[PDB]
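From: lab user (bench 3)
To: helpdesk
Subject: output format question, protein + calcium ion

Hello, I'm new to running complex predictions and I'm not sure whether the block I got back is the full result or only part of it. Here's what I submitted:
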Amino acid sequence: GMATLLYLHGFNSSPRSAKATALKTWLAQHYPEITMVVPELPPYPAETAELLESIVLEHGGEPLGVVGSSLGGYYATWLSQCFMLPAVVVNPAVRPFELLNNFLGHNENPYTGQQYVLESRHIYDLKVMQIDPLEAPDLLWLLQQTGDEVLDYRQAVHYYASCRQTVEEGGNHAFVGFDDHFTQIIEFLGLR
Ligand SMILES: [Ca+2]
Ligand SMILES: [Ca+2]
Ligand SMILES: [Cl-]
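Helpdesk reply: Thanks, we reran it on our side. This is the complete output you should expect:
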């Protein structure tokens, strides 16, 4: 049983994302005692929730912290507040029903090639994982760049107002300079 970092990728991303790979390589070099779990998330929110529950069951006997990017940050917030886990959320989607609206219909993940159909019922499924009000804001750290061209940064800054925040002017949705924050991330998550 080791401490574990759980990384949650964004919608239509994958575990081979640049951020996930950079963190996995850095963690293996500097903190090999912290294992990294990076699941391939189903596109269907109800099924993502069930998979994440099984991961928390498996890893909950040891320190466990979550990092999530974009929609992965929305899932990380739900895990944080439902399972009392610390989480760092990176350019998170806080109104994901608007985010996923333009993924309705048939889709193919550009990383993995998986084909899937997103239906309106899936968006309603995502809404049930919405946390409002935040009951344990001390468990969350928002990392946000104002230059995010996909999401309006102001939504996250307001939603996470009672949490630790690092808001950087400029940047983009992919989050520039993610690696500059890695030691502070492991410290916030209680894994160091
Ligand atoms: Ca573990
Ligand atoms: Ca579309
Ligand atoms: Cl996303």
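A quick orientation on your result: Residues 4-188 form a domain with the Rossmann fold fold (CATH 3.40.50.1820). Let us know if anything else is unclear.
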